[PDB]
């Protein structure tokens, strides 16, 4: 529960087709929030899933999404799904009973994503 | 890890539109395997997800699917996805990196599902 139990405060999960949008989010989050793009050995307090059409199509992305929700946001974790570039009708059904940020919100949803991240950090020692 | 730590050996997860197919599976599993249809207070060793078009469309089904994979099949659990009545092209992408039974297999996939259930039970005291 210690703020320093992890070296990063948040990492962004994205598919290869959204590399630039991910970098913008990382840049937006760090303006202090220490962020980076998620990687294999990546371990942070919060994980932002940049869910886009490309992401939803990629099997590995979906798998990472699953595990990101398996051991995390049950209550003790922090996983923030950002639905971007998608029609709400194409949103993953399971989201109706889960927290997530809509890309149509202010700042492409970045503002609410950052806010959600900060809220979690405060609950840390 | 005790075979009697749970009152049921397996329960079937289905959407309202597949009630009959679920009952057939339950019936098939018990011919000893103690099975039933999954319910809110339901707790068993294995959980069979009867994934069909209706299931994939229903938000609550998907959510239950998620949680069924969140705390389960990481290694210590038992969750068996049965893809039935669907074109493989419409299968959830995350399945490419996970175990699952195809409905096109022998006995509508029931045989392999039962086998998978038994395998898990043996690993129990």
Q: What is the 3-state secondary structure (H, E, C) of B20-58?
A: HHHHHHHHHHCCCCCEEECCCCCCEEEEEEEECHHHHHC
Residue B65 phi/psi, 5° resolution?
-65, -50
Half-sphere exposure of B63 (CA within 13 A, CB side): 12
Whether the CB-CB separation of A79 and A72 falls below 8 Å is answered with yes
Distance from CA of B11 to the nearest CA of A (A): 20
The dihedral formed by the CA atoms of A51, B69, A3 and A123, expressed in degrees to the nearest 10? 90
Distance (Å, whole) CA A80 – CA A20: 19
- B71–A70: do the CB atoms touch at under 8 Å? yes
DSSP state of B107: G
Tokens at B70, concatenated: 């969140």
Task: Specify the residue for token string 């309202």.
Answer: B16
* A interface with B, Cβ–Cβ below 8 Å: 56-63, 65-66, 69-71, 74, 92-98
Q: Which residues of A touch B58 (CB under 8 A)?
A: 93
Whether the CB-CB separation of A8 and A43 falls below 8 Å is answered with yes
DSSP assignment string, chain A = --TTSSSEEEEEE--GGGHHHHHHHHHHHT----EEE--TT--EEEEEEEE-HHHHH-HHHHHHHHHHHHTSSSSSS-EEEEE-SS-GGGS-GGGGGS--EETTSGGGGHHHHHHHHHHHHHT--
- A60–B98: do the CB atoms touch at under 8 Å? no
Whether the CB-CB separation of A40 and A67 falls below 8 Å is answered with no
Q: Which residues of B touch A57 (CB under 8 A)?
A: 93
By DSSP bridging, strand B35-37 and strand B8-13 are parallel
- A56–B97: do the CB atoms touch at under 8 Å? no
Q: Which residues of A touch B92 (CB under 8 A)?
A: 62
Residues 6+ apart with CB under 8 A from B73: B79, B98, B99
Q: Which residues of A touch B66 (CB under 8 A)?
A: 66, 69-70, 94
Distance from CA of B78 to the nearest CA of A (A): 14
The answer to whether domain A1-125 has CATH 3.40.50.10140 is yes
Tokens at B95, concatenated: 């399945």
- Resolution (angstroms) stands at 2.8
Strand partners, B44: B8
Whether the CB-CB separation of B33 and B9 falls below 8 Å is answered with yes
The closest CB to that of B94, out of A59, A95, A96, belongs to A59
Distance (Å, whole) CA B16 – CA B88: 22
Distance from CA of A27 to the nearest CA of B (A): 29
């Amino acid at each position: 529960s210690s703020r320093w139990s992890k070296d990063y405060d948040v990492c962004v999960c994205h598919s290869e087709e959204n590399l630039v949008a991910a970098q913008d989010l990382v840049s937006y989050l760090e303006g202090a929030i220490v962020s980076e793009l998620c990687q294999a050995l990546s371990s942070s307090h919060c994980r932002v899933l940049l869910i886009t059409p490309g992401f939803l199509q990629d099997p590995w992305c979906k798998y990472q999404m699953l595990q990101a929700l398996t051991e995390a946001p049950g209550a003790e974790g922090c996983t923030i799904p950002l639905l971007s570039g998608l029609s709400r009708a194409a949103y993953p059904p399971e989201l109706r009973f889960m927290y997530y940020v809509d890309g149509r919100g202010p700042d492409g949803g970045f503002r609410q994503v950052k806010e959600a991240v900060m809220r979690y950090l405060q609950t840390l020692s």
